């Protein structure tokens, strides 16, 4: 019925429109067709009659229409720097002659004539940095390619007479480059692309600091001077190139305007486009300046910008209009039955050359005719003579002018390669009208493609090696892109000599980021999104012939019909094509600018290098005035700045202070070089913030909507997350108060309407049609909504028991509810849907919500992990969210506030409102790709998930695929929450199309500091206060400023904000917290506000991070890798993640036996019985340093202790190793004291323990994932000689020795090989062979130990694996560098902190040091003491019992403090949660004669 009434509404609206041939009419038609398609496909009432289906199909054939729009009379072309004008002018003239009323525009970037020199300088800087990095990562092997390259760079010498020689030498050197091993080539590609990205980011930060709103040539010159030592000769060369290009453009345009008139052809400046400076496009044009390997071609973004802005026809300056009927006919008549002239490229190219010369009144028979037989030469000559005899103005025909609304036809090209016909679309020719939707779709696709390209940098934990086993389809894969860039850099230019088939590298076309293939893909997706109007353009997952232009008939009973094309195209086969630009036409050598990079200013590139400041060289450029004025501030800043940079954790107090004072130094200093140095410091701080990441606690929280009809999606999500990981704790949160308030709202709304089941449906549709046929239509809808909201406001205002108490009972107290509804109603009657039919409605409401909850509970009653929580019981009394619940809050964002409040309370992990699913793993995608196509995976995944979870087989998937899916464990096919990382600022955020939304909130692990949570708490309190003030109707500037005078959220307090807030308050007082947020800040979501809040505490780095968002960089609060997908299209929520191609590797979990021994009380037995044996074995093979630091964190062998192993891989020197060792000892002691003895810890110790455990879990998952993957780490079987030659010859610093149940670490610390086993500690050796023999012997130590490692009664040589990598930055990329400071800082327990200070406190009339008071254990409101209590905290200081009893169990406590403790215990009390202890603090043991001797000796000394 809803579908029928929607049909009626849409027909009513569409027939009354000012112009049906527009966007909204097309949208209405599309949605009508879609819903009618559902209706026909819906067997709701049988299949009706074949006649009804016939009616439906005739109707859908009818309603399509055409809605044709004309095209603007404009022709566009893009001028490319260095293009000779004498070649372009011919095609300009031909297009002007063919199209009479069209206006030709030549688009020229006046401010980028020198961009080629700048880009080449950046490219060679990047290549030299990559070469240096690769050389330093492979010191054992001397790569001769690098030596040859450096030798060539040295022998460059003379510039003017050696540029061509240098280019040719590089051309030959590419052949030598194509000889190194494949991993080296991958290293070059990855490093080269990454270095370009970093250099572009450095240039953009230079633009940010300089405060420039436009990028022009002298800005590039200044940047080059500030980066490299740029001389005056180079600036002269740059300016000469700029002037030469300007003169060429001026000459060309002057000649053309003289011959045709200065009104038909003119010149446009691309900087007039409003899309270059648009924030969404984030300056991808500048990036394309650099990441471009088809130099002679124009840019791909500018075409789309031009077509969107002005519209019309875009053409390349290398193309001619298509021939007319007569020309083709005469060509056939002069060749008889030889169709080779119209199909072979060479012959038609010669014909095109001849016709082009003829039309422009040049020497007709001067055609090249190269490599053409004499007979064909003569035939072409007669053909050209016949054409020349034919009058002009009839040789070229015009393309179709009319066009469907919101579409972009694409030129189609047919070529006759030796292997057959190649038919592809080209971006060389387009048609569009001003502002069509497909242009916007293609632009969005280009932005997404550029974001995905910038993934090797923006993502810390990327992939370096892929094995390139299978690669096809879209392929944005960075490895191939880097390969093409290296090809372009070294081997001159592309297209050299021969290129695959007929000088056409199709692989290039499939690899182009924004080439024709991306446009085709986005057009296909747009047409699919159109609906039932779209399949006319869709032909079996490919674009049909209707989308393209210049389509020839496919059925010519042999070849094609070159007489009557379906649509008219253009003659893209042109003598000035790339076939001449490759060899014949002179290659552009003005685009290269040699620059030796031995003079690189390393200290001015914070993104590339990490520089620690000092007082010697940091001030070697400042002016004397600023010197000795701010030099001292920087000098005493160094000590904190260097330790902040060289740290594993982030101290937010230190960071706040450092950044605030750097910003202060900025604001009060007037200089340009010192400001640049301090900005470099700020950029280093920002990069440090971005590199740090903290784990997530493997918890998913789902806040479902209990009003959706379908409930299988939530069950599917819960089951998928249960199957993804055997430790993922699932929480489902709801709120009885929220739905109760929703029900009351609906009741009041229906009542206030009253103030104004087939039979009931028929009556309602009759009433709706009756009011649609008279004045009640289009006159009271907005009245209904305004009146209901105003009466909701008024009912909120009156505040009776129905409001404050909300009638939470509804058992007997429905009587006053009914009489109140009568009072609010204007019926002045009885039982008017109030005494009757209302109790039934209430019963329906409660039964629906409660049965949904009951089904959710019962379906997962056997799983202890799935917990159903009620929000009303978790929140505290009197909080913001509690007051929102109590007063009555029914806005759609109440769930967002609930997520924020619940995270503030303490529950961590992912928070989401919709039904997320774990992302498919790489194995699942590989299985799917073995039978399907990449574009089909997104549609076939729901069936695969159904079969994996519910075991529901489908007929749409081959049985072999189902068997393969059933073969693998479910947790090998889905990606769990565990292992995901977030920014150290705290809460992350999901994203779409670059922007960040509130669909998913991923919070950091518990224990780690979280500033965003506190900022959100304070800001939500402020928003609630503002809400209350607007509700009361008493708000003005004064009290608004006073209400926000103490909180951080006062940086939004501008005049316009005040005016907007007051106007909105006067318009509609009762508004939502998110709406108030939008009115106050101007940002759409709270997620966008958080960075602004943080910039109050980080005035320098906060603004820098915000300002880098619109320069291509991801938001600092965004998520890189998405392990979640949405359950309606299966698209990742990540910023630059594509789940289909970049799928995460499956992690092999480790499972132990259920009877696993060594509980927490019995684990020390293992060390107790094996430590001495381990020591003897270590001494029996030669070891000068043996140290024991056994762990008590992991009693069982789950994860085979791999997490701990990875921590020992984090260190690379002995000092950091010792720091990590002692910190792990402290954490194990804390864990033993907490869990084994059941003694509560202090807040600091508990947080440290939680952080260490979260890190251990995350590293365990990551290590298990890395072990079972071959591209990342090279697995090897046990072989002593192989391993020792691996360390000696190949060169490896770190390796993991993995057994079935354990993991050992082997490092080359300094010159001494350290073998670490988390049990028994580490042993040092002077040679790898000794370490390997000791490992094998240590395995064969005791049958208990051998069994405990899972090597009992099994061969050792075939069950121990060795894992390593080819270079150490592989390890640096895999291992996260935010390890909570365990490897750099010495973590002090609260007892050590209290012992450090010496200040006894006066408690109960006696003096007691704070350390001893803590050791006794003093609980303030159920929490240990961390600071010395003041005079107002003593009476409330209780005493802990268990801690005290343990304290007596440990120490002897001589009477001199035993009496003091007696006084403390009697004066104070014992907290009820602990147990009482009898006073038995005495000391009378032994004799104090040894005490006499000890004091005698100490006085002696």
Numbering used by the authors: 242 to 997, 1036 to 1780
From the reporting publication:
Lymphostatin is a key virulence factor of enteropathogenic and enterohaemorrhagic Escherichia coli, playing roles in bacterial colonisation of the gut and in the inhibition of lymphocyte proliferation and proinflammatory responses. Here, we describe the structure of lymphostatin from enteropathogenic E. coli O127:H6, determined by electron cryo-microscopy at different pH values. We observe three conformations of a highly complex molecule with two glycosyltransferase domains, one PaToxP-like protease domain, an ADP-ribosyltransferase domain, a vertex domain and a delivery domain. Long linkers hold these domains together and occlude the catalytic sites of the N-terminal glycosyltransferase and protease domains.
Under these conditions, we observed conformation II and another, extended conformation (conformation III, ca. 40% of LifA at pH 8.0), which was absent at the tested lower pH values. Vice versa, conformation I had disappeared, which suggested that conformation I was a low-pH form and conformation III was a high-pH form. In conformation II it was close to the centre of LifA and in contact with the vertex domain and in conformation III the ART-domain was on the other side of the protease domain. The subdomain organisation of the C-terminal arm in conformation II was also maintained in conformation III. However, in conformation III the whole C-terminal arm rotated as a rigid body by 180° around linker L-IV placing the N-terminus of the S1-subdomain at the distal tip of the extended LifA. Concomitant with the reorientation of the C-terminal arm, the linker L-IV changed into an extended conformation and spanned the whole distance between the vertex domain and the distal end of LifA. In conformation III, the subdomains S2 and the C-terminus of S1 were adjacent to the protease domain. S1 formed several interactions with the N-terminal helix of the protease domain. One of these interactions was a π-cation interaction between H1448 and R2628. Such an interaction can only occur at high pH when the histidine is deprotonated and thus can contribute to the pH-dependent stabilisation of conformation III.
